[PDB]
Design a binder for this molecule. Structure first.
Ligand code: Y01
Ligand code: Y01
Ligand code: Y01
Ligand code: Y01
Ligand code: Y01
Lengths: 553, 296, 149, 49, 49
């Protein structure tokens, strides 16, 4: 801190440009200097107590990344947990009193902390336990169903999405009066998201339609060019989002967050598909890349549905199962080399091309895990005997097309035995031991990942708010409004506005629930049995001091 | 700061407007300011006293020009009379509230202060061993017919009033004391070195002498329910010449039920009620009438 | 009463597979190009033939050209190798059929190894959770049923 | 706290414990707020258990 | 006879958990601190000697 002042002297980082050498100030000082017991008390006297609890938890995670040692950081990061969990406990009192006004606590603009929203201060702070509580999650559903009554059903959103007359009905209750009803439907993050799902399955339907049928070597037709105009907008949205959501400093932060890589791989590959599909030489290579490109866009749909409250938690799990698959993928790959080469060495096929020798040591043993066990290609007792080879042995030609023309038969009691050992390791040992690995880590990581998905849910919800309401086929209308916005300037998210008088009524109600909560856990501290033994031993000893001065009698 | 739990005791500091010297003249539009008082900034300590930042309110009283301490007195006696008229309990039913003057020692004006309190029937609670106004009255209340020497003390009161008052006009300062002593029973002496933990029962003791046969019988146990103090209500009923009748317990359980207070309810049923003369259907309709207005 | 509580886990398997069945199925049907491309049959090789590979039915002879017999069954300028199956198309392609073999291998790792064994982790978890609630639930239901009869 | 004691003195004590748990789940469906309902529904759990 | 037998088991159960309440260690610390402090009030009025 001292050096961090002296670094800022001769010159979160904006706090350095703001702090130079009442309650709020004291608290800030305490935090900066780690006065851990004094930071707690300075929180207890000042207002903005929920946001200062998250604003404390903001800086202490930031300061712990700036500490050079592990002992000052983990002492600083533990005092971040105390302000998070007390901001959790204080909002839990405020949410159980007035769910409308505690919702106004999050969306309020505190002038401190760089004028950050209290939900924005919790996601900068990576405070996952603040998003885990039901007051924030129910408030995140209300913004997800923005002015659409978040107890709305799923199916009647779908029927209203395909019937915009059904918007103007008794269903889909909400909070120009005809035009006011329109934008609060289509501008809500449920209807934007469903419009980005229904259009994107139509992208995959169109992609498939232009890949299975309408893909002739000619220069392209109607539905192929409509795909090009489609994925130009998927290139636009992703690009625009990445640049918005100082130029190339946002670039390196965009090349992380590995689904942004899969958005990049998909489009990158797509280009290499269209670029090879338009040249006459590389046409068959152009379709091969676009078929891989359809898979990357289809797995991209599995990232779209992590916003879901029923699927989202699950999708995040199967990335945590990758360490268990990679053990299965290693242990099998050890055992597939061991079984596969020993089988191909015992029976000696005469067709020993390297694409086929590599096919019988990896691919034919790999398919035995999935029921495809070609006995007639490995067991000579199911083959027809022939002098198909000239080498001095006994051979018995197998019937398979890629089992070799003429295998051996010398130790084919052992190839039968080695198949039996393989099915015991692969199907019995390895498959059923992977389920033990999956059932264990699903016990472990789910309580962490559902704790993790809460915060992610909030971030996702917030995003769709900046995203325009029109579908990605039709989003050129939305992107030309931004291009006309940066050209009409040249000749010249949630954010609930608090009134000036309603702000203090928001604060003083919240500061009542702080002083009600501080005087609740102080009673539970004093009425703890550890404190009654503390106080009685301070009374018996004090009664013994009254006995010490009567002993003289 | 002594009890760190506490309940943040409330105390209204009724002052006159023309004495507070650091008046920032709070905001003439509508009076809504959070405006802070300037506290230590004064070289004066004369007739220009400040206001304290320890009271939950301050009923400033604007009689006239900035000056004497006389205008707020007729207000408080008009105020505390209204408080005593107000009933206590959820629904406006229960007991008339207890108001009492606590007379730590004062001056000539303090004696004519509490004469009006007797005229508005306030149970004064003067403390013995105090001084100027209290011990001048404390020696008189122990100078009644049986401890006094009959009519010889009528000439002795000439002497004892001068002991606490070197100031003149003794005659009405004698004469107004008997005007107080016409009442004689809306007034009790806090005995020196006989309370300070029993104070809460001495406060209780003065109210029963005050209600003792017109003022909406305070019954001494209905009162301990309204104070929400259980330890008083047991020792009143377990001890102290235990002669509780029917209607003494009947209206006591009403305020135990109307005001929530379930621990008082178990006490009264432990000492036994009728419940066949208690659950008359007026009282059940009375019980449902004290439901909160914004309920379900 | 338990297997109605397992429906949220099946619907994740049904979603994750349905994502992966579209991804594997259309990429396979795009790499090998069958000439019999009727919509009841194109829809049969992108959903139904990959779905049956989860249950042991893996038609290698219909996806791998190295198990097929080579022929100039098509007129388009490539190499084709007619597959023997009745609904595998009369004449698939063979251009990147090293990858269709590879894409089958990736499919069996996701469907049979990842997805099936991760569903058992989902079934074993919720059977730990919901059974103490559902047996608590079935008591009341038992009484109601008894009363009815 | 008074509902607990009035249960402790009257007869029909098993059925009044279920009859209490009947109405308090019913009243918690009739409360407009979540703070009076969950305080009412928690006092249903005390009469059930 | 169905009620009074059942109301016996209520008054037997209420006077069973009240004993377990009073013999809890949280209540013995409650009662001893109400006895040590009460013994200190007997020590406060012998200090004058
Ligand atoms: C005739 C043309 C215009 C329609 C094309 C047919 C399909 C491409 C459509 C019709 C039914 C649609 C589905 C109906 C049910 C919804 C629920 C919807 O859920 C939500 O977005 C909100 C839930 C949440 O995320 O919190 C997801 C999209 C989805 C699956 C829709 C995805 C696309 C579908 C399959
Ligand atoms: C040598 C052969 C067997 C190929 C081996 C390659 C595998 C290691 C790779 C190729 C395709 C991968 C899958 C393609 C689709 C994804 C979606 C992905 O979904 C998420 O969890 C999103 C959540 C998040 O990342 O935050 C999980 C991994 C998974 C199943 C991959 C699991 C591992 C796979 C099989
Ligand atoms: C699951 C764990 C144990 C890792 C196992 C990975 C293999 C099962 C996969 C990954 C790469 C695959 C190979 C990628 C390249 C081709 C070449 C291909 O041959 C040809 O291209 C010409 C046709 C022919 O004659 O076979 C035959 C299959 C093969 C070996 C594939 C067979 C199966 C392989 C070895
Ligand atoms: C696209 C293809 C794969 C069809 C997908 C449809 C499935 C979602 C449906 C069709 C038939 C259904 C099954 C038919 C029989 C029932 C009995 C039912 O038994 C109960 O739990 C009764 C208890 C209760 O409901 O209270 C549980 C669901 C189950 C297995 C259903 C599970 C899900 C199924 C497979
Ligand atoms: C399990 C999860 C991943 C969802 C997967 C659902 C499909 C595996 C199922 C649901 C609907 C089924 C289809 C329903 C309608 C028919 C048409 C049918 O064609 C005919 O009627 C004419 C005969 C012919 O030429 O095939 C062929 C199978 C097919 C596509 C079925 C094949 C398998 C399908 C796609």
């Amino acid at each position: 801190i001292r050096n961090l002042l002296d670094q800022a002297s001769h010159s979160v980082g904006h706090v350095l440009r703001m702090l130079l050498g009442p309650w709020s100030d004291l608290l800030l000082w305490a935090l900066l200097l780690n006065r851990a017991q004094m930071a707690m008390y300075f929180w207890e006297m000042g207002s903005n107590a929920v946001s200062s609890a998250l604003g404390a938890c903001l800086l202490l995670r930031v300061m712990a990344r700036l500490e050079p040692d592990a002992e000052e950081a983990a002492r600083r990061k533990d005092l971040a947990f105390k302000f998070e969990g007390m901001g959790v406990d204080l909002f839990g009192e405020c949410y159980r009193s007035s769910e409308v006004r505690a919702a106004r606590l999050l969306l309020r603009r505190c002038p401190l902390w760089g004028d950050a929203t209290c939900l924005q201060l919790a996601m900068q702070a990576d405070a996952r336990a603040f998003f885990a509580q039901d007051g924030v999650q129910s408030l995140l559903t209300q913004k997800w169903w923005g002015d659409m009554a978040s107890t709305t059903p799923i199916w009647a959103l779908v029927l209203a999405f395909f019937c915009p007359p059904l918007i103007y009905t008794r269903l889909i209750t909400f909070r120009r009066r005809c035009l006011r009803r329109w934008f609060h439907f289509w501008g809500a993050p449920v209807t934007i998201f469903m419009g980005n799902v229904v259009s994107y399955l139509l992208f995959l339907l169109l992609f498939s339609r232009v890949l299975l049928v309408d893909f002739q070597p000619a220069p392209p037709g109607s539905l192929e060019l409509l795909l090009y105009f489609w994925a130009f907008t998927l290139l636009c949205e992703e690009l625009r989002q990445g640049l918005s959501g100082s130029l190339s400093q946002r670039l390196r932060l965009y090349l992380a967050d590995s689904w942004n890589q899969c958005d990049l791989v998909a489009l990158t590959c797509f280009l290499l598909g269209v670029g090879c599909r338009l040249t006459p030489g590389l046409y068959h290579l152009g379709r091969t890349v676009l078929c891989i490109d359809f898979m990357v866009f289809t797995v991209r749909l599995l990232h779209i549905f992590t916003v879901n409250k029923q699927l989202g938690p699950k999708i995040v799990i199967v990335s945590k199962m990758m360490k268990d698959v990679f053990f299965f993928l290693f242990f099998l790959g050890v055992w597939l080399v061991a079984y596969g080469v020993a089988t191909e060495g015992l029976l000696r096929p005469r067709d020993s091309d390297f694409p086929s020798i590599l096919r019988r040591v990896f691919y034919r043993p790999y398919l035995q895990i999935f029921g495809q066990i070609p006995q007639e290609d490995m067991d000579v007792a199911l083959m027809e005997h022939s002098n198909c080879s000239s080498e001095p042995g006994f051979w018995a030609h197998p019937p398979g097309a890629q089992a070799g023309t003429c295998v051996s038969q010398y130790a084919n009691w052992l190839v039968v035995l080695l198949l039996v050992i393989f099915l015991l390791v692969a199907n019995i040992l390895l498959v059923n031991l992977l389920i033990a690995m999956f059932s264990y880590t699903f016990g472990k990581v789910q309580g962490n990942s559902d704790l993790y998905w809460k915060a992610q849910r909030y971030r996702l919800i917030r995003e769709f708010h900046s995203r325009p309401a029109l579908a990605p086929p039709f989003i050129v209308i939305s992107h030309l409004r931004l291009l006309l916005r940066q050209l009409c300037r040249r000749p010249r998210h949630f954010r609930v506005y608090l009134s000036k008088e309603a702000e203090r009524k928001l604060l003083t109600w919240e500061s009542v629930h702080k002083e009600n909560f501080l005087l609740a856990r102080a009673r539970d501290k004093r009425e703890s049995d550890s404190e009654r033994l503390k106080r009685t031993s301070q009374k018996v000893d004090l009664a013994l001091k009254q006995l010490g001065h009567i002993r003289e009698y | 700061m002594a009890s760190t739990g506490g309940t943040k005791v409330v105390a209204m500091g009724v002052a006159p407007w023309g004495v507070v010297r650091n008046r920032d003249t709070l905001i003439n539009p509508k009076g809504s300011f959070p405006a802070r008082y300037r506290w230590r900034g004064d070289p004066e300590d004369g007739v220009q006293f400040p206001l304290d930042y320890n009271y939950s309110a301050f009923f400033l009283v604007d009689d006239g020009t900035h000056g004497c301490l006389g205008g707020e007195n007729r207000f408080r006696l008009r105020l505390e009379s209204y408080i005593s008229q107000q009933k206590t309990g959820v629904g406006g039913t229960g007991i008339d509230i207890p108001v009492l003057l606590l007379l730590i020692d004062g001056d000539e004006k303090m004696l004519t202060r509490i004469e009006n309190a007797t005229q508005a029937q306030l149970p004064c609670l003067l403390v013995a061993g105090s001084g100027g106004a209290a011990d001048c009255l404390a020696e008189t209340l122990e100078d009644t017919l049986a401890p006094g020497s009959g009519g010889a003390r009528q000439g002795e009161a000439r002497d004892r009033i001068r002991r606490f008052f070197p100031k003149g006009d003794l005659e009405v300062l004698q004469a107004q004391v008997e005007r107080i002593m016409t009442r004689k029973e809306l007034l009790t002496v806090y005995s020196s070195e006989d309370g300070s933990e029993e104070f809460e029962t001495i406060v209780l003791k003065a109210l029963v002498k005050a209600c003792g046969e017109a003022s909406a019988y305070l019954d001494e146990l209905r009162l301990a329910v309204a104070w929400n103090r259980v330890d008083i209500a047991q020792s009143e009923l377990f001890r102290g010449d235990i002669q509780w009748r029917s209607f003494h317990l009947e209206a006591s359980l009403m305020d135990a039920l109307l005001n929530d207070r379930p621990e008082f309810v178990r006490l009264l049923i432990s000492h036994g009620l009728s419940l066949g003369h208690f659950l008359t259907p007026m009282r059940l309709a009375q019980l449902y009438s004290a439901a909160p207005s914004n309920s379900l």
